[PDB]
Amino acid sequence: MFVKQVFFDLGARIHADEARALVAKLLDDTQPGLVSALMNYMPASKTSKTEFPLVQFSNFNQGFALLGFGEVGAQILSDATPIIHDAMAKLFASRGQGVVVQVSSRDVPLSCEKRPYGLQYTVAKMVVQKKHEHRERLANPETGKVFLEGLFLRSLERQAAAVGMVLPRDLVVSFKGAERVSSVKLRPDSTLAHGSLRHAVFEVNARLGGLWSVGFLLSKGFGHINTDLQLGQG
């Protein structure tokens, strides 16, 4: 259907994961349920849902963005936006002279159709390795290629099924190469790190016309770029 993007500008850049931690810590004392809705927690406990995350935090050049997928996620952003804005307003008016926090909002529809020609789609900061078996596939290029193929495909089908629209199941993808390899830390000052690719290039015969998130740790703000912006653009 459609995905909503809401952009918040604090006057300074804040990373998506530490923005997620800050949003968790700011409204924790009061309004806990909205936090459960924002963070895709369980209704009863603190742990997160194993399904696709309807609400995922994202980069913004002056702060952080929120992405809500489907009618439910868009409604979550709709009920969450002013209380969240009011929290950063009181936090940034408590210290210093104060700053003014500016927003934007946009409702981008998602779409796809199959074309009989390959199309070049790049992604940046997408996590790929989570277990020791994923490390063992990544050592050899032949067995790592098909793993990345299946990962990119199953991410497309997962967020399709989650958004509630049908994808044609005859798509053939291909992976050309990635510019860099780097680690991703779940929490700072932790020894545990997870492998990730930088500026990976994929090639899909179909076209994609919305926000499409691929790979792991999607709610942390990794491996989504707008496919409308790359389209016919270099």
Binding site: G11, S78, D79, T81, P82, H85, D86, A89, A93, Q97, G98, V99, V100, V101, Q102, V103, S105
Partner: protein
Amino acid sequence: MQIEVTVRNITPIFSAAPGSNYITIDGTINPPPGVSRFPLVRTRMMYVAADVGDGVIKSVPLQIVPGNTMRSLLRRTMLKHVIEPALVEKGNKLSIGAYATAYSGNATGNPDGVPSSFDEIATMRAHPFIGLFGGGPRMLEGRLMVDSLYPIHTNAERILGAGYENEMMSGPITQVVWARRMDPILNLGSSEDVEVINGGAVAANGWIQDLLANSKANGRGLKAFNAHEVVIPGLKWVWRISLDRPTDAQVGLVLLALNKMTNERIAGGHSKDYGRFVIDGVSLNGEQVWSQSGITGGEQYFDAVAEAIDGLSSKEFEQFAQSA
């Protein structure tokens, strides 16, 4: 008495045609719904029969400025720079009704049922301002016939039978001009900008939340996007001012209003500077009198309006306006 005021428009011309029209991002005026129509107020259009192909006359569009619009315009310049200076130099005081009837033809919305006595008709008809624009409670006939602004265009070849055969424009004469509204509190950026707002940054922030609550969800906020169709500038227009057995004072008044015609605007869209124009030529019964320094010629009309400005009292405007 026939006058033909041929002008060129310096700024573009927007005289808003009524009708909630709609526009897409690229053309398609009044599209089918669901293409995200934007509101569009087109310029005033007159349908006109024209020689489209050989032997066939069709009702085609041609964008005009209304004759009622510029009747009120000629009356307005007449009154602001000739009549009101006369009534200040002799100290004559108009009433509310006299003022409103001199500018609008009526003091109230109810015209009186009785007709005016013939001495009042003769005196008012003889008077230049009253004769040019009648009206009032007893519904006076005026001597002035103000025709609409046609451009010198192919759609008006049937209109311009005599004269204006050259200087003919073939293509369309309209351009869509897009104006957006922007919200300044979205665009302020800095708190050193908000130190002049009372309440500080938190008040501006709270207004951002009001507009966010409107963005999720009928009080109109800000930041609209609009288009308006405009007539393109630099094109020659023709004005027709006919007169009905005029006194020399009434023609002299028309020429007195006409000389300064340029200061004013033949349009709407005041702030966009729409309506600026320069008169290329003025012909009295076909004779050219227009120069760069106003009208050169018609000295008996100017002398008659000179002697008619003197001795012009408020009581003419008072008596005509007064309802029975």
